């Protein structure tokens, strides 16, 4: 040990960052749909679709900024400061005492009939998204740099708890903050995430006295020659183009991953959900985000075992040494989880034909089937097993494959390509929704899937996952053969 | 080249042997139900089960004969002689001139009113099964020995066409012979397989003059010490205990393979099958064995593609160099096909609730759904890909991982474990048919599956195949570390 404080200061900062991030996306659409905004509903989702995507587009630029100009520590501080400044807009816009400061005059009782005061909301969203795009891309390698000088095993062990803290913050936000947002006034529900950002900034500032940092280079990106004699830059360029095909092959995996996250909650909305006494009954309601945190909960239990049992056993028998094989195992478990979800949806669609039951979640009535929500546990357990394999291995591969001088940008680029997979999936959902294909044709999310063929969509996702698993296996073998032997 | 005749003489012998083998199992049950036997369905099906039991159980002993007493090449001839002697019984029984010679005089024209010619038919079954068991264990290593002195690539290339010939003989028998036994004179229907056996014996005898044989090693099995000197007999035991777990983990693969092979035909019986002009109409009928040969047809096209395109590309890229990895790839395609079959059956079971069309195949009415049989093409393209990946690789692994002295015995043990897997699959099918689990509860095979749940059975088979794929991948790494690392 000895560097436990430097790891703790990064883990707590990441946890608070994740709590703040899920404090916004969980109920951004519902907050924009009501009281002083009253957007019709189509642009309320557009704001979220722009924020998620500004989170990805600005990640390589933040990585380049923290490698050429800033030292990846001052860059994290600057990103958290802009991130903190953009948080205050939501609590200031939810409180009537300060609403008139950012907006001219809006005191509508309820939505009566362009979009009121947009510039403040869009500025806050832009700053928050650019802060998130930089914080992830820089803190993911920065945290691993503390235990970097102990071999890849220490880095993998650190990334295990890094993802564990990411998921614990997500649960603390989706369960606690989102419940306060939905029932208690929006003011507290948007003041808590701002407090979390402030605490994360304070923790990073306090802990940067034990952090092991590195100075910016500033002459590593200007030497990206593509006209072909300098040395020590060639193998930095060669190792950068060598990993581009690996990142590209991960795009279908990201597509399937994000589409499953999108559709699993929608399917869970149409299952029988038990009511927790006087927590979801009159006059409160069950927050929708509570159905989103099913992946994370199983992760809080899987990662410890995976760090105490699975990893030691695999290392003892020399099984799965490289991260690219762990990614393939995660992709296979993703395919299994998609097939299980399709099997469950096939049974669920045959039950909404006899009888349905109305249930209220987000003050929206859903015609669920007489099938317990806990029948969806097997697919969530499979996807959690996949994420503790694929998600952690992808981060550690993006860490260990990047050049030393070009380290945050490559990790940023990784987070960019994930975003590329997020929007390709949304295009896939709009491709099966055309009149030619009846799959998922009942409008947007949080609607009604009793007339949708979600099981066929799940089977298609599983088939795509299998094909991209084979392609990724081929590319990972062609990468490992060159890396281990030729390099 | 140079040894092209020694390979053709074995390929033609295997083709004729396979044609004779499928000339029996294709219509043995229907033959025992009518004319001289008039057996009940239970005992007629038990006869086929006993025949399979002799085919699988006696293979290791047939291999031990070829290594300890006979010279393999002589063992194949001795087994083929008994095989031919046991084949004449069926044509003799079907012929009215010789039926009285076989047992007494039976004229149960309508089966108005406990086995007739039980000793004759049981001896014919036993000798035929023992001959098949001895041929299979000794024809594959003897065939591969002709090109053994050119490297593993030559052995794999020979096994490709060996499996191609196995499938071509199966198509020639199931398509040609089974049509003759079902619609036209039946005495020639069993006379053709006997002629095939006689031709195979003559071909092997003629090709014995170019065959590269090996001398028997009598003192090879007596050195199986299990208490713990000489040398090179320890290695033969070290390389025998080390391959047992691979076969043990392949047992569930054979389970899934055989159950999936039977249930695919069972489901194909309940799909809309086009009538082929005046070949299946009055007064003839579509042979059921044709619906069994649809897989083998897909094999006659994939092997030429694999031998000329897939194999060179994989070889010139360092992809899939070992047989165990190819077995794993085939096992993955098996669970993909099982999932595809479950998806198709889920749609087929929804259609039979509205409309069912009657069709006649085995002179028996089936209430098929209004869905073309060609929708089975995808699920058959995958098991076609698996067999050209898993079936060939398993044979080449059993050939290459066996000690030089003990080759036929190990090959026979491979088929014995395949039969063990087949019987475990039969037990599994009998397990889901209990009152507690409603899956596949409508009596025996070749019946009505519209009240069954075959999609659930397919999904369970897919899950079992995935689990055994993971297990086989775990053990295959623990075995390949003793091939060129420890050894």
Swiss-Prot record, chains A, B:
Q: Which CDD domains match?
A: MFS_SLC15A3_4
Q: Which SUPFAM superfamilies match?
A: MFS general substrate transporter
According to Swiss-Prot or TrEMBL, what is its membrane topology? Multi-pass membrane protein
The chemistry this enzyme catalyses reads:
glycylglycylglycine(out) + n H(+)(out) = glycylglycylglycine(in) + n H(+)(in); N-acetyl-D-muramoyl-L-alanyl-D-isoglutamine(out) + n H(+)(out) = N-acetyl-D-muramoyl-L-alanyl-D-isoglutamine(in) + n H(+)(in); L-alanyl-gamma-D-glutamyl-meso-2,6-diaminopimelate(out) + n H(+)(out) = L-alanyl-gamma-D-glutamyl-meso-2,6-diaminopimelate(in) + n H(+)(in); carnosine(out) + n H(+)(out) = carnosine(in) + n H(+)(in)
Tissue localization of expression? Highly expressed in skeletal muscle. Moderately expressed in kidney, liver, and heart. Weakly expressed in colon and brain. Expressed in low levels throughout the gastrointestinal tract and in Caco-2 cells. Expressed in retinal fragment epithelium (RPE) and neural retina. Expressed in small intestine, stomach, duodenum, jejunum, ileum and colon.
Checking Gene3D superfamilies in the record gives: MFS general substrate transporter like domains (1.20.1250.20)
Which keywords label this protein? Endosome, Immunity, Innate immunity, Lysosome, Membrane, Peptide transport, Phosphoprotein, Protein transport, Symport, Transmembrane, Transmembrane helix, Transport
Q: Where in the cell is it found?
A: Lysosome membrane; Endosome membrane; Early endosome membrane
Main localization of the protein?
A: membrane
Identify the Pfam families for this entry. Answer: PTR2
Tell me the InterPro entries matching this sequence: MFS_trans_sf, POT_fam, PTR2_symporter_CS
Give the superkingdom in one word: Eukaryota
Which residue ranges does UniProt annotate as crossing the membrane? 19-39, 46-66, 75-95, 122-142, 158-178, 186-206, 240-260, 285-305, 327-347, 381-401, 412-432, 457-477
- One GO term of the biological process aspect: monoatomic ion transport
**Gene Ontology CC:** early endosome membrane; endolysosome membrane; lysosomal membrane; membrane; plasma membrane; specific granule membrane
MF terms in GO:
dipeptide transmembrane transporter activity; L-histidine transmembrane transporter activity; peptide:proton symporter activity; peptidoglycan transmembrane transporter activity
Keyword Transmembrane carried by entry: yes
Q: Which PROSITE patterns match?
A: PTR2_2 (PS01023)
Q: How does it assemble?
A: Interacts with TASL; leading to TASL recruitment to endolysosome.
User: What is the stated purpose of this protein?
Assistant: Proton-coupled amino-acid transporter that mediates the transmembrane transport of L-histidine and some di- and tripeptides from inside the lysosome to the cytosol, and plays a key role in innate immune response. Able to transport a variety of di- and tripeptides, including carnosine and some peptidoglycans. Transporter activity is pH-dependent and maximized in the acidic lysosomal environment.
Q: What family does this chain come from, according to its entry?
A: Belongs to the major facilitator superfamily. Proton-dependent oligopeptide transporter (POT/PTR) (TC 2.A.17) family.
Q: What is this protein called?
A: Solute carrier family 15 member 4
Query: What is the species listed in this Swiss-Prot or TrEMBL entry?
Result: Homo sapiens
- Give the classification, highest ranks: Eukaryota, Metazoa, Chordata, Craniata, Vertebrata
> Which gene specifies this protein's sequence?
SLC15A4
């Amino acid at each position: 040990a000895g560097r436990r404080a430097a790891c703790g200061a990064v883990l707590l900062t990441e946890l608070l960052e994740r709590a703040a991030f899920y404090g916004i996306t969980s109920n951004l659409v519902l907050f924009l749909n009501g009281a002083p905004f009253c957007w019709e509903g189509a642009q309320a989702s557009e704001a979220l679709l722009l924020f998620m995507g500004l989170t990805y587009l600005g990640s390589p630029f933040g990585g380049w900024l923290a490698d050429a100009r800033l030292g990846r520590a001052r860059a994290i501080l600057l990103s958290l400061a802009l991130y903190l400044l953009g948080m205050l807009a939501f609590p200031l816009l939810a409180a009537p005492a300060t609403r008139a400061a950012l907006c001219g005059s809006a005191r509508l009782l309820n939505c009566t009939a362009a979009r009121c005061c947009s510039p403040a909301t869009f500025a806050g969203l832009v700053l928050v998204g650019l802060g998130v795009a930089t914080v992830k891309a820089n803190i993911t390698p920065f945290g691993a740099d503390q235990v970097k000088d102990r071999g890849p095993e220490a880095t993998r062990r650190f990334f295990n708890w890094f993802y564990w803290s990411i998921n614990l913050g997500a649960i603390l936000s989706l369960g606690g903050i989102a419940y306060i947002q939905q029932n208690v006034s929006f003011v507290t529900g948007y003041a808590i995430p701002t407090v979390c950002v402030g605490l994360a900034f304070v923790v990073f500032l306090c802990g940067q006295s034990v952090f092991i940092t590195k100075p910016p280079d500033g002459s590593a990106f200007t030497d990206m020659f593509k006209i072909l004699f300098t040395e020590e830059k060639v193998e930095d360029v060669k190792a950068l183009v060598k990993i581009v095909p690996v990142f590209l092959a991960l795009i279908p995996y990201w597509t399937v991953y994000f589409q499953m996250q999108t559709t699993y909650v929608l399917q869970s909305l149409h299952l029988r959900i038990p009511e927790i006494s006087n927590i979801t009954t009159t006059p409160h309601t069950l927050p929708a985000a509570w159905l989103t945190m099913f992946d994370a909960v199983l992760i809080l239990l899987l990662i410890p075992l995976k760090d105490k049992l699975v990893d030691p056993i695999l290392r003892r028998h020399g099984l799965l040494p490289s991260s690219l094989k762990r990614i393939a195992v995660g992709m296979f478990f993703v395919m299994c989880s998609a097939f299980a979800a399709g099997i469950l949806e096939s049974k669920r669609l045959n039950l909404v034909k006899e009888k349905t039951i109305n249930q209220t979640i987000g003050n929206v009535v859903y015609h669920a089937a007489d099938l317990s929500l806990w029948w969806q546990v097997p697919q969530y357990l499979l996807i959690g097993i996949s994420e503790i394999f694929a998600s952690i291995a992808g981060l550690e591969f993006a860490y260990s494959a990047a050049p030393k001088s070009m380290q945050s940008a490559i990790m940023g680029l990784f987070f960019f390509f994930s975003g590329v997979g997020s929007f390709v999936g949304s295009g896939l959902l709009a491709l099966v929704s055309i009149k030619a294909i009846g799959w998922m044709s009942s409008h947007t999310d949080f609607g009604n899937i009793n007339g949708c063929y979600l099981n066929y969509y799940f089977f298609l996702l599983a088939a795509i996952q299998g094909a991209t698993l084979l392609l990724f296996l081929i590319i990972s073998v062609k990468y490992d053969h060159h890396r281990d032997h030729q390099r």
